[PDB]
């Protein structure tokens, strides 16, 4: 069970979704299906870059795994 | 007796439902039955996260316990 | 005499009913009888919550008193 | 002479009947006589409330005066 | 002492300021002196009109009085 | 002094503006100079048509007079 | 000991200050003496109004007490 | 595969986009298409100048290559 | 060994200091002894408030313990 | 092609703009158009003075040529 | 051979020092012996933290190794 | 012939010394044989780093070459 916490563009408080798969094969398409967003949103994900530190990488490929930032998938929308 | 408070997407004022069960076994399906919403709504629930603080976690499993935030179930819809 | 003002779902102008009982024993069933609504409506009532402010609490128990919001029972339907 | 305008439930155009009494002692039962409605209708009357503005108060007592909203009794039925 | 409550444009929770004058002769310039708005703001005030009910009237003259809507000056900004 | 009541697109409560000219020569551009709208708005004014009853007519000429409705300029925006 | 949580203008995460006096006699100037703000700031405080619910009331008198909203002095700056 | 780390004007954390082309033919229009920016933004790019050192050169031509600063396209927006 | 990461006023990248005491009994005065700040600075520390989430609480007593936010003392200066 | 390097007031890293005109007719107005600055800024330019060495001369005339300091237009803003 | 680039307090251009030992066992006291600073300075070294990204960590033990951030020991003084 | 422009600690006017060897094999000890500095001074030389831009690298080996920054050996003392 992964608690994928995400945000949106203007709302100040973050959200959370319980995702039924563990944190070794969780992809973008599993997180995208349980949100029911109307159009194509920008799915940023908080990852650790070896050159710049914390980065919010946009993922648009549904086969790409989610970056488990300290075992807690922090995401963003729009 | 639990006084669950829920909002909606666009309306500015919160709601309230008196729920006859106490605050140790209240689930989503008890709250979902007394609302009589037409379609599948996004049932967010204000919960305290150990990493980010106040989060609004979406609950879809009807067996899940509601996260009573300081003894006051704050909720959100749509 | 209590002037319980109520609204409906889509109509922008509010209604009003003169109710012959005073504001210490007025319940849901006294207000529900003089309206002659065809089916089960959502009887919201504007109340003052000490944690979130103004709330529109749904009352479905006919023994429950109506929340006298500053001596003026503001209500909602559907 | 009072030109009481009244509406009905579904039809969009308003009617207009004449009541021979002036606008200080016109009652509900005087207005109820010239309408020849078959059953008990909901006689709403457009009145000015000091807390919410324009309200449509249902009058069911035949001794109650009609609210002269700017000298023009706007009414509603059903 | 007047509890003149004012809103802003996008902020949903309202403010409150105290004025040292009573409610009988409170002007806009007394309310304009405890705010210090950075630009020329639109000072709407909740008033009761005899033809339309609750209106939010714009007051621009600093010597003009404020409408005590039920003994509570409700205002709006921008 | 004219009380030009104007509504907006989605807001339910109407506004009010005191205008320093009388009702005999009040124009749209005089009413437009006191609102300072951010873009070109649709200024629908409540008028009385002799074939269809009450109408909300668009006025775009800034020197065009405003149709009073029983001595009260009712307007609409957007 | 009181936990007087306060926000700032643009900063989204809130602050916290322990104040050595209890909640029964805590004043603004006691809270003002522990921040040492570089200019005259606007000290809004979350209070409960009996007509509008939660309000952020501005307090400027240094001897005026602070509204203990549910035993927690929430505040705002600028 | 190139990981184009970029920033914006006010946000403190950098972003990242995975770009499916390698680092010998990547242009500005390839990076501009996957961002879906609303208007014409200032596309600065971190480059090594032999006279002044690290510079952030604005690129507006879509045929121009991106400066591979140590094999990592660091960029800026607005 | 504690890694007390701390920020400054305008500098966006954070610092880090090692403290020879463990995290269970670390005080402000031990953290204040490895900095040698030129004046009295504001020592905000990231803590978890049970009513508002993450807060930056100011600690001024040198014998007061530091809030181990997820086993990591995050701090701020001035 | 001229690669004009410019700085700003507080940012430590220099910028760069490619300019499609050569270094014999480049003026201030050609450089000012491609920057899209909001207000009137101080456009300093590095030039070699015969009495004081390197100087940053302010140019405000759009007909004035840019001083090609060793074939490299070094500039400054604000 | 290591290129230990370091900065100072007010000087914006960075320095560089060739150190005769490799990057596997380079310590602070080896780097401290080649500068001969006139007083005890703060040796902030750019390191990669797994919870916040890039950090400027302070090293005070002369036998403590230096964090080779991407094979380049970036440092700071005072 | 080389024009090795160099500075001192507090003097803002740079010096210039001629060295009878060309730029291809100019060493520090050849530059050290022209100045005759009264003590062991720090010989920083303006070089181009491929990760940080312009740097002032300290050279202490007398047989080590000097970095020809754009064909002009800019140096520093103490």
Author numbering:
A (entry chain C), B (entry chain D), C (entry chain E), D (entry chain F), E (entry chain K), F (entry chain L), ...: 13 to 90
Show sentences the authors wrote.
We obtained a cryo-electron microscopy (cryo-EM) map of the DIX filaments with a global resolution of 3.6 Å, which enabled a near atomic resolution structure. Remarkably, unlike the single stranded fibers observed in crystals of Dvl2 DIX domains, in solution the Dvl2 DIX filament forms an antiparallel double helix. Successive protomers in the filament are related by a rotation of 48.0 ± 0.2° around the helical axis, with a rise of 13.5 ± 0.3 Å per protomer. The pitch of the helix is 101.3 Å, larger than the pitch of the single stranded helix observed in crystals of Dvl2 Y27D (85 Å) and Y27W/C80S (88 Å). The head-to-tail interface within each strand is similar to that observed in crystal structures. For example, Y27 packs against F56 and K68 of a neighboring protomer. We next tested the role of the inter-strand contacts that form the antiparallel double helix. These contacts are formed between two opposing protomers, principally by the β3-β4 (residues 60–66) and β4-β5 (residues 82–84) loops. Some residues on the β3-β4 loop (e.g., D63) participate in intra- and inter-strand interactions, whereas others appear to be involved solely in inter-strand contacts, including M60, G65 and N82. The structural, biochemical and signaling data indicate that the double stranded DIX filament is stabilized by inter-strand, antiparallel contacts that are functionally important.
